[PDB]
Amino acid sequence: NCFCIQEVVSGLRQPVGALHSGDGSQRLFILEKEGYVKILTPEGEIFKEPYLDIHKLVQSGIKDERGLLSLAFHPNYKKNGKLYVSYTTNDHILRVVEYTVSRKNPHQVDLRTARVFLEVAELHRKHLGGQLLFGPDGFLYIILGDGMITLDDMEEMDGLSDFTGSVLRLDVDTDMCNVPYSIPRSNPHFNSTNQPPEVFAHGLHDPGRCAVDRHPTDININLTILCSDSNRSSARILQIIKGKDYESEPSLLEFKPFSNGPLVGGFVYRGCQSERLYGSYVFGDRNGNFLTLQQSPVTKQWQEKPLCLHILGFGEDELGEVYILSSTHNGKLYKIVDPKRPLMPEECRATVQPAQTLTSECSRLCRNGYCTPTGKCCCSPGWEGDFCRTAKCEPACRHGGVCVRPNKCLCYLGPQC
Amino acid sequence: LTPLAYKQFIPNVAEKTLGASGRYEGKITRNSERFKELTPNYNPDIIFKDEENTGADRLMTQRCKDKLNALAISVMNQWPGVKLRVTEGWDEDGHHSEESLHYEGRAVDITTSDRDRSKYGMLARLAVEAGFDWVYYESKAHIHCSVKAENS
Ligand SMILES: [Ca+2]
Ligand SMILES: [Ca+2]
Ligand SMILES: [Ca+2]
Ligand code: NA
Ligand code: NA
Ligand code: NA
Ligand SMILES: [Zn+2]
């Protein structure tokens, strides 16, 4: 009837969420408001060196949702070592960049490999976002709140985002180099010359942490995003129909489940530790009060049940177990365990494979350019060929014509033969 | 006439170039002597939001007054009962990215009267044909137009 939480580590520094990479390392990555990302081994050890240090690039501030917002490891992180983070920087800017772990230290990202995807303008520091996450199709989702930006604002001010209050969806897996991301054909505004192709659906305002069901009971639905928006607080959810090529944005489904009060956020439990929780929505408030939501294959109604046991956010390890980040420089991480089961059921076990240095062909021999998440080596200006080894000439060489040194062809005579 | 596409601009260059609206002169404040080059616009066939109540949305350079009044005719002609609406004109401080042509009365943020965004693209085209030296489908909420200075 009643759940229990156990401390994993204290002394944290303004934690906002915890997630995993999915590479067998079972490391627990802890996002910190200020702009840090700490690593935590399964056994419970913490790393001396941050996995991501960008407290200079990110503007924190206490009160104010500015700072480190979200992070999302690329599904094939084990191969390409790609990751995507969002944060505020300079009112300010909500930025979404792609980083790449160093090919020498699997426990620290190379800051040189930074690659900006989205830069969103912001006027206030509330209703920001900026939850990042991947879907079953591998596409990247970006939940952005309205950021207190009114219609009048977007109508009498130049240079405003136009993505605020909407759910964005872009394909990072591209064999293209002229762009950071491509728009999925499935998107409502793919091939659209009247609306932003990044926008899948809009209507959000002040969305807390939105719960994500990756295996919806509904056969015709491949993914569902449930958000607890406090705007008069309701709760809207995003339906992503299986095998549907949207030709226009879907409407966020609006319903009022939660009894009464503001909510930090929620999540779906896909763990092994608990059976009486598997598939349940779990939303909690900053006071420590939790609840569980569940629907029905028929009638499609909802029921709210109290969850017996300040909140800053939730986490989840590579094994599905959920965590609770609670409260300067004193944040704590709590793991949720079901008393009706051992702390580690034999079926929940999984040998630990420590993170290893990238080996992919691209990351192995790709010079003068970066690697796309699909293992392609995009060439920087002045290079060509599979891995950008074939020198570029300007003017290019005519009669072969092997270019070597800076714009110095190798014939015939002359600069270009 | 094929309406401009989202985030598209004509000419396909930066706003402050010789081919476009031209280089930035400076910030034309009220106490600035150059202010008197900005005369109010009282075209009955134009709706000014003037959310500032200052009527700064009407102040604009002669060339802008010409292009605008010429655009206001296309609008009424294109969609009956639908006039040209101006949300922003000449500004007297922060509200646009510095170096903006709104500070000079050379820029205008416009929409239709019915706010129906489905024509915001066609409006941008009618602006290009109206003479505006640079029309930009800025956001889904409005299009941005600008002209050159008397220095052309
Ligand atoms: Ca938030
Ligand atoms: Ca105005
Ligand atoms: Ca103004
Ligand atoms: Na489509
Ligand atoms: Na399903
Ligand atoms: Na190539
Ligand atoms: Zn403007």
Coordinates of C-alpha atoms and ligand atoms in Angstrom, one line a residue:
Chain A
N1 CA 0.0 0.0 0.0
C2 CA 2.8 2.4 0.8
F3 CA 6.1 3.0 -1.1
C4 CA 9.5 3.8 0.4
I5 CA 12.3 6.2 -0.7
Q6 CA 16.0 5.7 0.0
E7 CA 18.8 8.3 -0.2
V8 CA 21.4 7.7 -2.9
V9 CA 23.5 10.8 -2.5
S10 CA 23.2 14.2 -0.6
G11 CA 25.2 17.4 -1.1
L12 CA 23.9 17.9 -4.6
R13 CA 23.7 21.4 -6.1
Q14 CA 20.3 22.4 -7.3
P15 CA 19.3 19.2 -9.1
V16 CA 16.6 19.4 -11.8
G17 CA 16.5 15.9 -13.2
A18 CA 18.2 12.5 -13.5
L19 CA 18.5 10.3 -16.6
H20 CA 20.5 7.5 -18.1
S21 CA 22.5 7.0 -21.4
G22 CA 21.5 3.4 -22.2
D23 CA 24.9 2.0 -22.9
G24 CA 25.2 -0.7 -20.2
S25 CA 27.1 1.6 -17.9
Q26 CA 24.0 2.2 -15.7
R27 CA 25.5 5.6 -14.9
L28 CA 23.0 8.1 -13.4
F29 CA 23.4 11.6 -14.9
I30 CA 22.4 14.4 -12.6
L31 CA 21.5 17.8 -14.2
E32 CA 22.3 20.8 -12.1
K33 CA 20.5 24.2 -12.4
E34 CA 23.8 26.1 -12.5
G35 CA 24.9 24.3 -15.6
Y36 CA 26.7 21.1 -14.4
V37 CA 26.1 17.4 -15.1
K38 CA 27.4 15.0 -12.5
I39 CA 27.9 11.2 -13.0
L40 CA 26.9 8.6 -10.5
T41 CA 28.0 4.9 -10.9
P42 CA 25.3 2.2 -10.2
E43 CA 27.0 1.3 -6.9
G44 CA 26.6 4.9 -5.8
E45 CA 30.0 6.6 -6.4
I46 CA 30.1 10.1 -7.7
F47 CA 32.7 11.4 -10.1
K48 CA 35.4 14.0 -9.3
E49 CA 35.1 15.6 -12.8
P50 CA 31.7 16.9 -14.2
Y51 CA 30.4 15.2 -17.3
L52 CA 29.3 18.5 -18.7
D53 CA 30.6 21.9 -17.5
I54 CA 28.9 24.9 -19.0
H55 CA 28.1 27.1 -16.0
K56 CA 29.7 30.0 -18.0
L57 CA 27.4 29.6 -21.0
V58 CA 24.2 29.2 -18.9
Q59 CA 22.6 31.9 -16.8
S60 CA 21.2 30.5 -13.6
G61 CA 19.6 32.7 -11.0
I62 CA 17.5 32.0 -8.0
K63 CA 13.9 32.8 -7.1
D64 CA 13.0 31.9 -12.1
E65 CA 13.3 28.9 -14.4
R66 CA 16.5 30.0 -16.1
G67 CA 19.4 27.6 -16.1
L68 CA 19.9 24.0 -17.1
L69 CA 16.5 22.8 -18.3
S70 CA 16.7 19.4 -19.9
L71 CA 19.1 16.8 -21.4
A72 CA 18.5 13.8 -23.7
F73 CA 21.0 11.1 -24.8
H74 CA 20.8 10.0 -28.4
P75 CA 19.4 6.4 -28.5
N76 CA 22.6 5.3 -30.3
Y77 CA 24.7 7.1 -27.7
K78 CA 26.6 3.9 -27.2
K79 CA 27.9 4.2 -30.7
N80 CA 27.8 7.9 -31.8
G81 CA 28.1 9.3 -28.3
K82 CA 25.6 12.1 -29.1
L83 CA 23.7 14.1 -26.5
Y84 CA 21.3 17.1 -26.6
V85 CA 21.0 19.7 -23.9
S86 CA 18.8 22.8 -23.4
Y87 CA 19.5 25.9 -21.3
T88 CA 19.1 29.6 -21.0
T89 CA 21.9 32.0 -22.1
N90 CA 22.6 35.6 -23.2
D91 CA 16.2 39.1 -21.8
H92 CA 17.7 35.7 -22.5
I93 CA 17.7 32.8 -24.9
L94 CA 16.5 29.2 -24.6
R95 CA 19.1 27.3 -26.5
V96 CA 19.1 23.6 -27.6
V97 CA 22.6 22.3 -28.5
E98 CA 24.1 18.9 -29.5
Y99 CA 27.2 17.9 -27.7
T100 CA 29.5 14.9 -28.2
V101 CA 31.3 12.9 -25.5
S102 CA 35.1 13.1 -25.8
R103 CA 36.7 10.2 -27.7
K104 CA 39.2 9.9 -24.9
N105 CA 37.1 10.2 -21.8
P106 CA 33.7 8.5 -21.9
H107 CA 32.8 10.4 -18.7
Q108 CA 33.2 13.9 -20.1
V109 CA 31.8 15.7 -23.1
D110 CA 34.0 17.5 -25.6
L111 CA 33.0 21.2 -25.4
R112 CA 34.5 21.9 -28.8
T113 CA 31.9 19.6 -30.5
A114 CA 29.1 22.0 -29.5
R115 CA 26.5 22.4 -32.2
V116 CA 23.5 24.6 -31.8
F117 CA 20.1 23.4 -33.0
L118 CA 17.6 25.9 -31.7
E119 CA 17.8 29.4 -30.3
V120 CA 14.6 30.6 -28.7
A121 CA 14.0 34.2 -27.7
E122 CA 12.6 34.8 -24.2
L123 CA 11.3 38.0 -22.5
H124 CA 10.5 36.5 -19.0
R125 CA 12.0 33.6 -17.0
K126 CA 8.7 31.7 -16.5
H127 CA 6.7 29.2 -18.6
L128 CA 9.9 28.4 -20.4
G129 CA 10.3 24.6 -20.8
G130 CA 12.4 23.0 -22.0
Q131 CA 11.9 19.3 -21.7
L132 CA 13.9 17.2 -24.3
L133 CA 13.2 13.6 -25.1
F134 CA 13.4 11.0 -27.9
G135 CA 10.4 9.0 -29.2
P136 CA 10.0 5.4 -30.5
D137 CA 10.8 6.6 -34.0
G138 CA 14.0 8.2 -32.7
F139 CA 12.8 11.8 -33.3
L140 CA 13.6 14.5 -30.9
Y141 CA 10.8 16.3 -29.0
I142 CA 11.1 19.7 -27.4
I143 CA 8.4 20.9 -25.0
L144 CA 8.5 24.7 -24.8
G145 CA 6.0 26.7 -22.7
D146 CA 4.5 30.0 -23.8
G147 CA 7.2 31.9 -21.8
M148 CA 4.7 34.5 -20.7
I149 CA 4.9 35.9 -24.3
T150 CA 1.4 37.2 -25.3
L151 CA -0.1 37.5 -28.8
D152 CA 0.3 41.2 -28.7
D153 CA 4.0 40.7 -28.0
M154 CA 4.5 38.4 -31.0
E155 CA 2.6 40.9 -33.1
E156 CA 4.4 44.1 -32.3
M157 CA 7.9 42.8 -31.6
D158 CA 10.5 41.6 -34.1
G159 CA 12.7 38.5 -33.5
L160 CA 10.4 36.4 -31.3
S161 CA 10.7 32.6 -31.2
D162 CA 7.3 31.5 -32.6
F163 CA 8.0 28.1 -31.1
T164 CA 6.9 29.0 -27.6
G165 CA 4.0 27.1 -26.1
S166 CA 4.4 24.3 -28.6
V167 CA 5.8 20.8 -28.9
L168 CA 8.6 20.7 -31.4
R169 CA 9.7 17.5 -33.2
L170 CA 12.8 17.2 -35.4
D171 CA 14.9 14.4 -37.0
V172 CA 18.5 14.6 -35.8
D173 CA 19.4 11.5 -37.8
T174 CA 20.3 12.9 -41.2
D175 CA 22.9 12.4 -43.9
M176 CA 22.7 16.1 -44.5
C177 CA 25.4 18.7 -43.6
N178 CA 23.8 22.1 -44.5
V179 CA 21.4 21.7 -41.6
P180 CA 21.5 20.6 -38.0
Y181 CA 18.3 18.7 -38.3
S182 CA 15.6 17.7 -40.8
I183 CA 11.9 17.8 -40.5
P184 CA 10.1 14.4 -40.3
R185 CA 7.7 13.7 -43.2
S186 CA 5.2 12.6 -40.5
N187 CA 5.2 16.2 -39.2
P188 CA 2.1 18.3 -39.8
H189 CA 4.1 21.0 -41.4
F190 CA 6.6 19.1 -43.4
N191 CA 7.0 20.6 -46.9
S192 CA 5.0 23.6 -45.6
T193 CA 5.7 27.1 -46.9
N194 CA 3.3 28.9 -44.5
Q195 CA 4.1 27.5 -41.0
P196 CA 7.2 26.4 -39.0
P197 CA 8.0 22.7 -39.9
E198 CA 9.5 22.2 -36.4
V199 CA 6.1 22.6 -34.7
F200 CA 4.1 19.4 -34.3
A201 CA 1.4 20.8 -32.0
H202 CA 0.9 23.8 -29.8
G203 CA -1.3 25.1 -26.9
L204 CA 1.0 24.7 -23.9
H205 CA 1.6 27.4 -21.4
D206 CA 3.4 26.5 -18.1
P207 CA 4.1 22.8 -18.5
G208 CA 5.8 21.1 -15.6
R209 CA 7.7 17.8 -16.2
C210 CA 5.5 16.0 -18.7
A211 CA 5.0 12.3 -18.2
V212 CA 5.9 10.1 -21.2
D213 CA 4.2 6.7 -22.1
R214 CA 6.3 4.9 -24.6
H215 CA 4.0 1.9 -24.8
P216 CA 0.4 3.2 -24.8
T217 CA -2.2 0.5 -24.2
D218 CA -4.1 2.0 -27.2
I219 CA -2.9 -0.1 -30.2
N220 CA -3.4 2.9 -32.6
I221 CA -1.2 5.1 -30.5
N222 CA 2.6 4.8 -30.5
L223 CA 3.4 7.6 -28.0
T224 CA 1.6 9.9 -25.5
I225 CA 2.9 13.0 -23.7
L226 CA 0.9 13.9 -20.6
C227 CA 1.6 17.4 -19.3
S228 CA 0.4 19.0 -16.0
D229 CA -0.1 22.6 -17.1
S230 CA -0.9 25.1 -14.4
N231 CA -1.6 28.0 -16.9
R232 CA -6.9 27.5 -13.5
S233 CA -4.8 24.4 -13.7
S234 CA -5.7 21.6 -16.1
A235 CA -3.7 18.9 -17.9
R236 CA -3.2 18.3 -21.6
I237 CA -1.8 15.3 -23.4
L238 CA -0.3 14.8 -26.9
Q239 CA -1.4 11.9 -29.0
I240 CA 0.9 10.5 -31.7
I241 CA -1.1 8.0 -33.8
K242 CA 0.9 5.0 -35.1
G243 CA 1.6 5.1 -38.8
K244 CA -0.1 8.5 -39.3
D245 CA 1.3 11.2 -41.7
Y246 CA -0.1 14.3 -40.1
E247 CA -1.0 17.0 -42.6
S248 CA -2.1 19.4 -39.8
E249 CA -1.3 19.9 -36.1
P250 CA -3.2 17.7 -33.7
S251 CA -5.2 19.2 -30.8
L252 CA -3.8 18.8 -27.3
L253 CA -6.4 16.7 -25.4
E254 CA -7.6 18.8 -22.4
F255 CA -8.9 17.2 -19.2
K256 CA -8.9 17.9 -15.5
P257 CA -7.8 14.9 -13.5
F258 CA -5.7 16.2 -10.6
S259 CA -7.8 16.9 -7.6
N260 CA -6.5 20.4 -6.7
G261 CA -3.2 22.1 -6.5
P262 CA 0.0 22.8 -8.6
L263 CA 2.2 19.9 -9.7
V264 CA 6.0 19.7 -10.3
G265 CA 5.5 17.0 -12.9
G266 CA 5.0 13.3 -13.6
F267 CA 6.3 10.2 -15.3
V268 CA 5.3 6.6 -16.3
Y269 CA 6.8 3.7 -14.4
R270 CA 8.5 1.2 -16.7
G271 CA 10.5 -0.4 -13.9
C272 CA 11.1 -4.0 -12.7
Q273 CA 11.4 -3.3 -8.9
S274 CA 7.6 -2.8 -8.6
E275 CA 4.7 -4.6 -10.2
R276 CA 1.9 -2.7 -8.6
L277 CA 3.3 0.5 -10.2
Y278 CA 4.3 -0.7 -13.7
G279 CA 2.4 1.4 -16.3
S280 CA 1.1 4.0 -13.8
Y281 CA 1.4 7.7 -14.1
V282 CA 3.0 9.3 -11.1
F283 CA 2.7 13.1 -10.5
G284 CA 3.8 14.9 -7.3
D285 CA 4.0 18.4 -5.9
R286 CA 6.8 20.3 -4.2
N287 CA 5.4 19.4 -0.8
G288 CA 6.0 15.6 -1.3
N289 CA 2.5 14.5 -2.1
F290 CA 2.1 12.0 -4.9
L291 CA -0.7 10.4 -6.9
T292 CA -1.2 7.8 -9.6
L293 CA -3.2 8.2 -12.9
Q294 CA -4.6 5.4 -15.0
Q295 CA -7.0 5.2 -18.0
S296 CA -9.1 2.5 -19.5
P297 CA -9.0 0.6 -22.9
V298 CA -12.8 1.4 -23.0
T299 CA -14.6 4.5 -21.7
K300 CA -11.1 6.0 -21.7
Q301 CA -11.7 7.6 -18.3
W302 CA -9.2 8.5 -15.6
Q303 CA -8.9 7.6 -11.9
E304 CA -6.8 9.3 -9.2
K305 CA -5.2 7.3 -6.4
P306 CA -3.1 8.7 -3.6
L307 CA 0.5 7.5 -3.5
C308 CA 1.6 6.7 0.1
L309 CA 5.3 6.9 1.2
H310 CA 10.7 20.1 -1.5
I311 CA 10.5 18.3 -4.8
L312 CA 12.7 19.7 -7.6
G313 CA 12.2 16.9 -10.2
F314 CA 12.3 13.2 -11.0
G315 CA 14.9 10.8 -12.4
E316 CA 15.3 7.3 -13.9
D317 CA 18.2 4.9 -14.2
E318 CA 19.0 2.6 -17.1
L319 CA 17.0 -0.1 -15.4
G320 CA 13.7 1.7 -15.3
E321 CA 13.8 2.6 -11.6
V322 CA 12.5 6.1 -10.8
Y323 CA 14.1 8.7 -8.6
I324 CA 13.1 11.9 -6.7
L325 CA 15.3 15.0 -6.5
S326 CA 14.5 17.1 -3.4
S327 CA 15.9 20.1 -1.5
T328 CA 21.8 26.1 -1.3
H329 CA 24.1 23.4 -2.4
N330 CA 22.3 20.6 -0.5
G331 CA 20.0 18.9 -2.9
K332 CA 19.4 15.1 -2.5
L333 CA 18.6 12.2 -4.7
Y334 CA 16.0 9.6 -3.5
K335 CA 15.3 6.2 -5.1
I336 CA 11.7 4.8 -5.0
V337 CA 11.5 1.2 -4.0
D338 CA 8.5 -1.1 -3.5
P339 CA 8.5 -2.8 0.0
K340 CA 6.5 -5.8 -1.5
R341 CA 9.7 -6.7 -3.5
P342 CA 13.4 -7.0 -2.8
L343 CA 15.7 -4.0 -3.5
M344 CA 16.9 -5.9 -6.5
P345 CA 14.8 -8.8 -7.7
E346 CA 16.9 -11.4 -9.5
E347 CA 14.9 -10.6 -12.7
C348 CA 15.9 -7.0 -12.5
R349 CA 19.6 -7.8 -12.5
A350 CA 21.9 -6.8 -15.4
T351 CA 25.6 -7.1 -15.6
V352 CA 27.3 -3.6 -15.7
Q353 CA 29.3 -2.7 -18.8
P354 CA 31.4 0.4 -18.1
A355 CA 31.2 3.2 -20.7
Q356 CA 33.8 2.7 -23.5
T357 CA 35.6 5.0 -25.9
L358 CA 33.8 5.6 -29.2
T359 CA 34.8 3.2 -31.9
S360 CA 32.5 4.1 -34.8
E361 CA 34.2 4.4 -38.2
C362 CA 33.3 8.1 -38.3
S363 CA 34.6 9.0 -34.8
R364 CA 37.7 6.8 -35.7
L365 CA 38.9 8.6 -38.9
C366 CA 36.8 11.7 -39.5
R367 CA 39.0 14.8 -39.7
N368 CA 38.0 18.4 -40.8
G369 CA 34.4 18.2 -40.0
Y370 CA 31.9 16.6 -37.5
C371 CA 30.0 13.4 -37.3
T372 CA 26.2 13.2 -37.7
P373 CA 24.4 10.9 -35.4
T374 CA 24.1 8.5 -38.4
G375 CA 27.9 8.1 -38.5
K376 CA 28.4 10.4 -41.5
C377 CA 31.4 12.7 -41.6
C378 CA 30.2 16.2 -42.8
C379 CA 33.0 18.1 -44.3
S380 CA 34.0 21.6 -43.2
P381 CA 34.6 24.3 -45.9
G382 CA 37.6 23.3 -47.9
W383 CA 37.3 19.5 -47.8
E384 CA 35.6 16.6 -49.5
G385 CA 35.5 12.8 -49.7
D386 CA 34.1 10.2 -47.3
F387 CA 36.1 11.5 -44.3
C388 CA 37.1 14.9 -45.7
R389 CA 40.7 14.0 -46.6
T390 CA 40.5 15.0 -50.3
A391 CA 41.7 18.6 -50.3
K392 CA 39.5 21.3 -51.9
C393 CA 40.8 23.9 -54.4
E394 CA 39.5 27.3 -55.3
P395 CA 39.5 27.6 -58.1
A396 CA 39.3 23.8 -58.2
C397 CA 41.9 21.7 -60.2
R398 CA 41.2 21.0 -63.9
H399 CA 43.4 18.4 -65.5
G400 CA 43.9 15.9 -62.7
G401 CA 44.7 17.8 -60.9
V402 CA 45.4 16.5 -57.4
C403 CA 44.9 19.3 -54.9
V404 CA 47.2 19.3 -51.8
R405 CA 48.4 22.5 -50.2
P406 CA 46.2 25.5 -49.7
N407 CA 44.6 26.1 -53.2
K408 CA 47.7 24.7 -54.8
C409 CA 46.8 22.3 -57.6
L410 CA 49.3 19.7 -58.8
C411 CA 49.4 19.4 -62.6
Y412 CA 50.7 21.2 -67.8
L413 CA 51.3 24.3 -65.7
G414 CA 49.5 27.1 -63.9
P415 CA 47.6 27.6 -60.6
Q416 CA 44.7 25.3 -61.8
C417 CA 46.5 23.7 -64.8
Chain B
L1 CA 0.7 36.8 -57.2
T2 CA 2.2 34.0 -55.1
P3 CA 2.3 35.0 -51.4
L4 CA 5.7 35.0 -49.6
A5 CA 6.7 31.9 -47.7
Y6 CA 7.2 31.6 -43.9
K7 CA 10.4 33.4 -42.8
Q8 CA 11.0 34.5 -46.4
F9 CA 12.2 37.9 -47.4
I10 CA 12.6 39.9 -50.7
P11 CA 15.1 40.8 -51.8
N12 CA 16.8 37.6 -50.6
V13 CA 19.5 39.7 -48.7
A14 CA 20.0 41.5 -45.4
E15 CA 17.7 44.3 -44.7
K16 CA 20.4 47.0 -44.4
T17 CA 22.2 46.6 -47.7
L18 CA 22.4 48.7 -50.8
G19 CA 20.0 46.3 -52.6
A20 CA 17.6 46.4 -49.6
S21 CA 16.5 49.2 -47.3
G22 CA 20.1 50.5 -46.9
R23 CA 22.5 51.1 -44.1
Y24 CA 21.5 52.2 -40.6
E25 CA 21.7 55.9 -40.0
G26 CA 21.0 56.2 -36.3
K27 CA 18.5 56.3 -33.5
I28 CA 16.0 59.1 -34.1
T29 CA 14.9 60.1 -30.6
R30 CA 12.2 62.8 -29.9
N31 CA 14.7 65.5 -28.9
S32 CA 16.8 64.6 -31.9
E33 CA 16.8 67.3 -34.5
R34 CA 16.2 64.7 -37.3
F35 CA 12.8 63.9 -35.7
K36 CA 11.0 66.3 -37.9
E37 CA 11.5 64.1 -40.9
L38 CA 8.9 61.8 -39.3
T39 CA 5.4 63.0 -40.0
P40 CA 2.2 61.3 -38.6
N41 CA 0.1 59.2 -41.0
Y42 CA -3.6 59.7 -41.0
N43 CA -4.7 57.4 -43.8
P44 CA -8.4 56.5 -43.0
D45 CA -7.9 53.2 -44.8
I46 CA -5.3 52.0 -42.3
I47 CA -5.7 50.6 -38.7
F48 CA -3.1 51.6 -36.2
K49 CA -3.0 49.5 -33.0
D50 CA -1.2 52.3 -31.2
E51 CA -1.0 50.2 -28.0
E52 CA 1.4 52.8 -26.7
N53 CA -1.3 55.5 -27.0
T54 CA 1.6 57.8 -28.1
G55 CA 0.6 57.4 -31.7
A56 CA 4.2 56.4 -32.5
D57 CA 2.9 53.8 -34.9
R58 CA 1.9 56.5 -37.3
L59 CA 5.2 58.4 -37.4
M60 CA 7.2 57.4 -40.5
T61 CA 9.5 58.8 -43.2
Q62 CA 8.0 60.2 -46.5
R63 CA 9.1 57.1 -48.5
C64 CA 7.4 54.9 -45.9
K65 CA 4.3 57.0 -46.1
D66 CA 4.2 56.4 -49.8
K67 CA 4.8 52.6 -49.8
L68 CA 2.3 52.2 -46.9
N69 CA -0.5 54.2 -48.5
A70 CA 0.2 52.3 -51.7
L71 CA -0.1 49.0 -49.8
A72 CA -3.3 50.0 -48.0
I73 CA -5.0 50.1 -51.4
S74 CA -3.9 46.6 -52.5
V75 CA -5.2 45.2 -49.2
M76 CA -8.8 46.6 -49.6
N77 CA -8.7 45.5 -53.2
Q78 CA -7.5 42.0 -52.4
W79 CA -10.0 41.2 -49.6
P80 CA -13.2 43.2 -49.3
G81 CA -13.8 44.8 -45.9
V82 CA -10.2 44.0 -44.9
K83 CA -7.9 46.9 -44.4
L84 CA -4.2 47.2 -43.7
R85 CA -3.3 47.1 -40.0
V86 CA -0.1 48.5 -38.5
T87 CA 1.0 47.1 -35.1
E88 CA 4.4 48.8 -34.8
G89 CA 6.0 51.8 -36.6
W90 CA 8.6 54.2 -35.2
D91 CA 9.8 53.2 -31.7
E92 CA 11.3 55.4 -29.0
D93 CA 13.5 52.9 -27.2
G94 CA 14.2 49.2 -26.6
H95 CA 11.5 47.0 -28.2
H96 CA 13.4 45.9 -31.3
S97 CA 17.0 44.6 -31.8
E98 CA 19.3 47.6 -31.8
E99 CA 20.2 49.0 -35.2
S100 CA 16.6 48.4 -36.1
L101 CA 14.9 50.5 -38.9
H102 CA 12.0 51.0 -36.6
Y103 CA 14.0 53.6 -34.7
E104 CA 14.2 55.6 -37.9
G105 CA 10.5 55.4 -38.9
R106 CA 11.6 53.3 -41.9
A107 CA 10.1 50.1 -40.6
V108 CA 6.5 48.9 -40.1
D109 CA 5.1 45.7 -38.6
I110 CA 1.8 45.1 -40.3
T111 CA -1.1 42.6 -40.5
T112 CA -4.6 42.4 -42.0
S113 CA -7.6 43.8 -40.2
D114 CA -9.2 40.5 -39.5
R115 CA -5.9 39.1 -38.1
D116 CA -6.6 36.0 -40.3
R117 CA -3.0 34.8 -40.6
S118 CA -3.8 32.8 -43.8
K119 CA -3.2 36.0 -45.8
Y120 CA -0.1 37.3 -43.9
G121 CA 1.9 35.8 -46.8
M122 CA -0.1 37.4 -49.6
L123 CA 0.1 40.7 -47.6
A124 CA 3.9 40.4 -47.7
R125 CA 3.8 40.0 -51.5
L126 CA 1.4 43.0 -51.9
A127 CA 4.0 44.9 -49.9
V128 CA 6.8 43.9 -52.2
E129 CA 4.7 45.0 -55.2
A130 CA 3.7 48.1 -53.2
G131 CA 7.3 49.2 -53.4
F132 CA 8.7 48.4 -49.9
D133 CA 12.5 47.9 -50.3
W134 CA 12.4 44.9 -48.0
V135 CA 9.5 42.7 -46.9
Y136 CA 10.1 40.0 -44.4
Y137 CA 7.7 37.3 -43.2
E138 CA 9.1 37.9 -39.7
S139 CA 6.7 35.8 -37.6
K140 CA 3.5 33.9 -38.0
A141 CA 1.9 36.9 -36.2
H142 CA 3.0 39.7 -38.5
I143 CA 5.2 40.7 -41.5
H144 CA 7.9 43.3 -41.4
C145 CA 8.4 46.0 -44.0
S146 CA 11.0 48.7 -44.5
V147 CA 12.1 51.3 -47.0
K148 CA 15.3 53.3 -47.8
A149 CA 16.1 56.8 -46.6
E150 CA 16.1 60.1 -48.5
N151 CA 19.6 59.0 -49.3
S152 CA 18.6 57.2 -52.5
Ligands
CA1 CA 9.9 23.5 -16.0
CA2 CA 2.7 49.8 -31.5
CA3 CA 6.4 50.7 -29.5
NA4 NA 3.2 15.4 -43.2
NA5 NA 0.3 1.4 -28.5
NA6 NA 31.1 13.4 -47.2
ZN7 ZN 9.6 45.0 -37.4

